[PDB]
Amino acid sequence: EFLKPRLVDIEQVSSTHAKVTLEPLERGFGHTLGNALRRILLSSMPGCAVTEVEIDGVLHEYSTKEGVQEDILEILLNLKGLAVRVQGKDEVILTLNKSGIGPVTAADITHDGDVEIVKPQHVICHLTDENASISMRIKVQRGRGYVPASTRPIGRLLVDACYSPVERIAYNVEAARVEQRTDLDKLVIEMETNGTIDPEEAIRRAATILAEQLEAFV
Amino acid sequence: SVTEFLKPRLVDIEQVSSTHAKVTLEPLERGFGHTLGNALRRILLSSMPGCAVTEVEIDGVLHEYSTKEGVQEDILEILLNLKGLAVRVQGKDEVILTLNKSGIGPVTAADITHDGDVEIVKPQHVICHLTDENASISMRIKVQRGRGYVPASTRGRLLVDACYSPVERIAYNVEAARVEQRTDLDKLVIEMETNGTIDPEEAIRRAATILAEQLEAFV
Amino acid sequence: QDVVLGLYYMTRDCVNAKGEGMVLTGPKEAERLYRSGLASLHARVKVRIT
Amino acid sequence: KPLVGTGMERAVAVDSGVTAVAKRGGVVQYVDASRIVIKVNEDEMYPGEAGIDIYNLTKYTRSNQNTCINQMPCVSLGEPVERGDVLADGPSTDLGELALGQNMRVAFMPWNGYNFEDSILVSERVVQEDRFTTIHIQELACVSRDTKLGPEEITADIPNVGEAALSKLDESGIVYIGAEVTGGDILVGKVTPKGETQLTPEEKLLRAIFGEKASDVKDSSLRVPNGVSGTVIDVQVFTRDGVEKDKRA
Amino acid sequence: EIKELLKLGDLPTSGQIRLYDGRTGEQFERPVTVGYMYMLKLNHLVDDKM
């Protein structure tokens, strides 16, 4: 009867994109599982994108702050790409306080050890003069998919939500000459995340989602 | 809150004669209709356990475009009829059945020797028409249990394309579903037609079991 | 324009494609073969048509 | 930055007065979101006056077509600049090259009829990246005039509407800057003594018997057009000579 | 020159690559033309027309 595939290798190429292996797979099941897992991963993976941002002297996102080279809109756009991991809390409020010339990066955020910033070098903005400072509050929540700010004080700036750690998924079906048996498929899934989700955890969540959806008629 | 989705239910199962059915699921999450339908279709028409006529030997035929006296159907047509001969067999993998008959008229499936544990699901399935008296059709059909569709092109004995999978046709049709407020959802609509070995619902549930078992190593 | 192109591509033949020359038991078998990837959409065959 | 251009993008961008072309070469002494200060080189410096160029970038402002005109600096601190080089790039420009749109990955094939005649099928990634998101600035003018039956007033005491609808207004009856208004919201609620007629003794007695305190003030109350949302970025009050400008003004 | 520049990269000289269907995961025969084209968002927005 059917051989059950299992996770045999997690080949971490870089910090962001990994390459997991599922083996063994019968004829045809390789493509079926690859496409199903690709759709599930690209569709529904929990993420921790920013939701709201509050700068002290800013009333709306179409203004400017003295000494900041970037418009508030560009700051919000940069934050929208911030990759962050939260473990214990569904919702957290990070703080960023910086003063003096230089690139205000994601590493200037308050540590808050329960929250991990995967790209400390991710530039947020630039400060041009010594007497210019940015003191701002960022609201990071768990979620799923894409939640535009339009669907969901006069100082609160909403940034569109991008709760999707995955960025690219590609599955290849190769030949697995193992178990003294020929024409057994091996599914190599190369997944490029933003660094906030474990590839093994991502595959596990995708399989769990597919099984839960499949339980409706079994 | 970010882990539980809209788990669908079999909202409508409208059916026609037992070899055909139409199942409907709603409301599926955005995009899940296509993936579920594609996975089910692939598993059902590519890898489903079953048994069908694998190869038939005639007493006096050694070539595909051969001729027999007194049979209206050509070798091609009788091979086609045997291809659609739905057969159910017990745990035994391969079995050989014999068909012997003389006289003017149809040669139905029931005409096959009833001895053995092989069960015929379409007894009135026409295999051939023989029009004369002195000619007698004598043949042996070998049926094996397989894992989908295996064309005879994959390599006086005649090879028949073995269609092990019970399903004759399957097609999913993802449509638009509705919820209290959400609208960008899916309404999976499976339409199945089987050869009669098992019911369409049984085929769907077997495919779901196969997929879930294949995913037990991660869940 | 798109439907006619799709139908023109569907109903067409080439001298040699996958699953050519095999005899089919009906249109349902043809669709099963095409979806399963065992025969090209445009390959000369024999089909039992009613 | 069109990947496949023709070499005329830079000329078009520079010649049209949308960028901040450096009048004289020098070194960028200061640069923020709304200003550039270039310390001119000694070679190009006139005698006497000193002599550093100041470019005040035009931030978010309305165009004739209700688009957004916004100049963003394209230079950093201490970066040398030559004469004629772009310091800030206006709308539809990247590093001084005309960029009217966005370049993205396109495939030519029919797709289930969703690109049937001339339709385009766009992925959710295009809208996720907000690359074709546009800012449109819209101007709404409420004019209080001196009509018959008295003048018009910009007071916040709007009849027939609760305090919830008037929460976003200040004490002077004008919306706050930065308030997120949607269709139907009252931006500047003006109600005028130009209301309705006066009721004769029997008529007025009957009206008061019904238990209603409708006054001689009607509701004009400029409000956002239905279906239009956004954020208020500027409020300008032009007052005629001798009118006792209000607290908001 | 376009072919030469394509070959300088690891791209096919024909300008057409092989694409797979996002829904079914099945390869599209007849390799399709994929590139990078400059879309413009013209000032005719639906919400200004409805």
Swiss-Prot record, chain B:
Residues 1-219 are annotated as: Alpha N-terminal domain (alpha-NTD). GO terms for cellular component: cytoplasm; DNA-directed RNA polymerase complex. One of its GO terms (biological process) is DNA-templated transcription. It catalyses: RNA(n) + a ribonucleoside 5'-triphosphate = RNA(n+1) + diphosphate. Keywords: DNA-directed RNA polymerase, Nucleotidyltransferase, Transcription, Transferase. Its EC number is 2.7.7.6. It is an enzyme of class 2 (transferase). Belongs to the RNA polymerase alpha chain family. DNA-dependent RNA polymerase catalyzes the transcription of DNA into RNA using the four ribonucleoside triphosphates as substrates. This is DNA-directed RNA polymerase subunit alpha. It comes from Escherichia coli O157:H7. The gene is rpoA. The chain holds residues 4 to 232 of 329 of the full protein.
Curated annotation (Swiss-Prot), chain D:
It comes from the Bacteria. The RNAP catalytic core consists of 2 alpha, 1 beta, 1 beta' and 1 omega subunit. When a sigma factor is associated with the core the holoenzyme is formed, which can initiate transcription. Belongs to the RNA polymerase beta chain family. DNA-dependent RNA polymerase catalyzes the transcription of DNA into RNA using the four ribonucleoside triphosphates as substrates. This is DNA-directed RNA polymerase subunit beta. It comes from Escherichia coli O157:H7. The gene is rpoB. The chain holds residues 697 to 945 of 1342 of the full protein.
UniProtKB/Swiss-Prot annotation, chain E:
The modification N6-acetyllysine is found at K7. DNA-dependent RNA polymerase catalyzes the transcription of DNA into RNA using the four ribonucleoside triphosphates as substrates. Signal peptide: none annotated. Belongs to the RNA polymerase beta chain family. The RNAP catalytic core consists of 2 alpha, 1 beta, 1 beta' and 1 omega subunit. When a sigma factor is associated with the core the holoenzyme is formed, which can initiate transcription. This is DNA-directed RNA polymerase subunit beta. Transmembrane segments: none annotated. It comes from Escherichia coli O157:H7.
